[PDB]
Amino acid sequence: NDLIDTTEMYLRTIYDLEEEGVVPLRARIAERLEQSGGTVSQTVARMERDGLLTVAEDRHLELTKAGRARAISVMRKHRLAERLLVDVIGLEWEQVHLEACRWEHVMSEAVERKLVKLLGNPTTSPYGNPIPGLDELGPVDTDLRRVDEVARSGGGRALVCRIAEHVQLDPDLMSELKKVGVVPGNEIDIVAVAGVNKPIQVQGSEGGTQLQPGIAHAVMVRVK
Amino acid sequence: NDLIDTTEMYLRTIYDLEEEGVVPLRARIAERLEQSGGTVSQTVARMERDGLLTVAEDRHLELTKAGRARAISVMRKHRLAERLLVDVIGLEWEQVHLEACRWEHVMSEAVERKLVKLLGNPTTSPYGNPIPGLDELGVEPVDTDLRRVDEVARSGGGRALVCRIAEHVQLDPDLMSELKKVGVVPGNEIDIVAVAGVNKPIQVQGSEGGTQLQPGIAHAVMVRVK
Amino acid sequence: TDLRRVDEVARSGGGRALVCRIAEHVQLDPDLMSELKKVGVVPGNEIDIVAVAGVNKPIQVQGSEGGTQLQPGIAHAVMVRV
Amino acid sequence: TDLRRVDEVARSGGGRALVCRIAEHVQLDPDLMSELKKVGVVPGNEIDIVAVAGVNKPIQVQGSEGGTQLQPGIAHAVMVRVK
Amino acid sequence: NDLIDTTEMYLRTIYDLEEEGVVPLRARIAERLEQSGGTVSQTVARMERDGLLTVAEDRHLELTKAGRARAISVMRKHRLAERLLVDVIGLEWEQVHLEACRWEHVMSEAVERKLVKLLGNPTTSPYGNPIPGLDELGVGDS
Amino acid sequence: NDLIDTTEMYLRTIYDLEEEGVVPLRARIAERLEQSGGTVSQTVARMERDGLLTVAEDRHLELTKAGRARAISVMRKHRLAERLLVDVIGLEWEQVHLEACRWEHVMSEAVERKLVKLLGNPTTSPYGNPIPGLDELGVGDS
DNA sequence: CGTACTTAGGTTAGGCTAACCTAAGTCAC
DNA sequence: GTGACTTAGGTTAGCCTAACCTAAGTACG
Ligand SMILES: [Co+2]
Ligand SMILES: [Co+2]
Ligand SMILES: [Co+2]
Ligand SMILES: [Co+2]
Ligand SMILES: [Co+2]
Ligand SMILES: [Co+2]
Ligand SMILES: [Co+2]
Ligand SMILES: [Co+2]
């Protein structure tokens, strides 16, 4: 699937992995953007040459000040696009991320400033994710816990707060989550599970569903 | 076709172009080995990194002492392979180059030394091309009197003795079968018809019949005029 | 077909006309677009097209808020109803 | 097959045998191939295979020009016709 | 200036020239997209290979059935984007076209159908240029 | 040591192991070609994908109809090269195999036919190993 | 004497498969 | 414990198309 801008999508994938608390290896970029290991290293090398990132001792990718700034501007465009598509245009909830993943690469700062006024200074995306870099354009979340860790700790009732970009990429799953009512601002019951890499059962208001470990890891909640 | 060894085939293509008196540009390598301009630049860059060649001011490729030595050892293996295939094994004249272009990448110096003894210290390939690097393995004739069929034709043509068919011409087995049929082969006389201006099909009359040679083909056939 | 280009109207001896279309070619020059808006050469507004004689000659137009000089290639890319 | 492996002939109680095949595995050791040629473990030559007891024990053979010790994996990869 | 999509910008440039009543020659594309004549000839040959356009005897570029359909969908996205940027987002009149020239390459037909409803069935861009291919969109699940 | 052709060297290695009466496991290839277990599993999977071999329940590698045919042509070239190198070229007995192991990957069926006539219809290599697939060659234009 | 186009040689970004590696982790006996 | 594979994250060589460039032609009017 066409990235529109390869560089900006590498920067944003690193930013997504950080938000999800995943070590940003080149193998993560490879599996997410569906490219060969060589392509990723070759592209990561061009971005190191341009001075947007560096490779650390344990081979995890670190953003430079210019790289982080650029990564933030892309993520800001993405989430303002999602707000516009949901609040104003009225695009279906499950289709909004895929549209915004293209729009993020063509939106000027001039449109961003106009969208901030139109949308009334929004601070979160329609999937509960904070909108960064609003200061550059012109809340404590330390209590939030991941559905997998909650389940491994005995489960219980919790309020859905965030669905990460990773989960948004699968429109079928997002349609399923909306149906059963695993959406931001709704309460869910997380059933307990032992060990790791195990499917996690969750009961929403309208029904129940299973979340894969990497999915459940990317859904942040506030426990009762 | 598969090059078997990319590096050795790049080195030998530069050597072929020098022997044919053609400026060895990356565009020449792209044409002959049928690869993109980017592929050639990227591969040439790896060989520059290894210290086998360099890019000159006019962007023509120059071999280093290590690169020229390696290029000579490949061309030696090639032409000793061609001698073996013709003289001993008896492979058809038109098919020998294509076989030899693969064998040149796998033949050891040990086998080369044995082939020199078996074939009786040959100095030319079956297509009349001198065999280099025989000294490195363990009286060369003055070839300054030789002229290219195209230059002979542009100078008014006339009768000449066929002496060399370059590696470039050998790549086309159908053309080589045609050349053999009409008798445009090393050690045979030909009558070269005169032509006006460059980039013109050159007519030649052999012992058994006549044929037309393209400018790049005629340029790659060396003769001694009457 | 009922629409006419400003350059042809000028060469034909000018006239009053309703601005209908500004082609994509004109829009690629923001500074020109600002000027066109300022003097009032915008869709729905009436303009006076001044008579011109020759080829490669600037076309003079008068909008509600003033006048401007259009280059031949610009005037060709603005369509009006006479 | 009527052919037998040198290692199996040794374990059976040895004997005189005609060398028939040297597998590609043996040929990959030039130093071993030189020794095999020197003592006369080559196709068409007769050798004496000395009786051996147990597994992973080196096989002793006698050629026309002397004797050599074959490793079990080498002796397995040489095929003979027992007289 | 980044075209975002080379093919779509060549198609729309040929489309613009036809709307302006100018002869669509390779030289016109070279001028308007600020590229060398060799680049235009090469890209045009690639688009001719892919069945998007043909070259006439007088050498003017002609959009195929497939070429015109693609050109229309790009132009439809362009002019719906312009309407959104002026009427809803409130971007300045003179800055809208440059924004819409990037947006036209990333807008889905799904968004297009929502913009038709939002903007109340627009027939023209803010610059009075008719929106083509509106009947091609349909109403989807609505 | 450069294999020249990975596929052909995997096929001939499995062929060698069957001739020796050894169980052809991935671990045998790893030892003999001096490659990591992961490289062998990976390459074997490619060759299984391309229909050259299958893995049995006991995990021993089996050549398909296509795999055995390719393995036989490599081994035929190998053992004809060995006969040429010893009988005609006069390369030393112990150096011949290493040479023939490279030559087997570049010899045409056209040369093979000329070698059969030259060497007087050989049935074995200089090391007594039968030459397989001789009936597959034919006589060409003779 | 320009305008439109072709020719020749080249660069860059962004992709791919094949064929290797090291280094832990797992599995059947 | 041992041998036989799997997994996880890499590298390198050797290819590709698309989309640009400069420079110096030829073609036509
Ligand atoms: Co999103
Ligand atoms: Co994106
Ligand atoms: Co040759
Ligand atoms: Co070659
Ligand atoms: Co516009
Ligand atoms: Co555009
Ligand atoms: Co052998
Ligand atoms: Co081999």
mmCIF file of C-alpha atoms in Angstrom, chain E residues 7 68 92 119:
data_model
loop_
_atom_site.group_PDB
_atom_site.id
_atom_site.type_symbol
_atom_site.label_atom_id
_atom_site.label_comp_id
_atom_site.label_asym_id
_atom_site.label_seq_id
_atom_site.Cartn_x
_atom_site.Cartn_y
_atom_site.Cartn_z
ATOM 1 C CA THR E 7 0.542 10.606 -13.921
ATOM 2 C CA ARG E 68 -10.194 11.022 -19.572
ATOM 3 C CA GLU E 92 -7.815 32.370 1.931
ATOM 4 C CA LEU E 119 -21.625 21.366 0.450
#
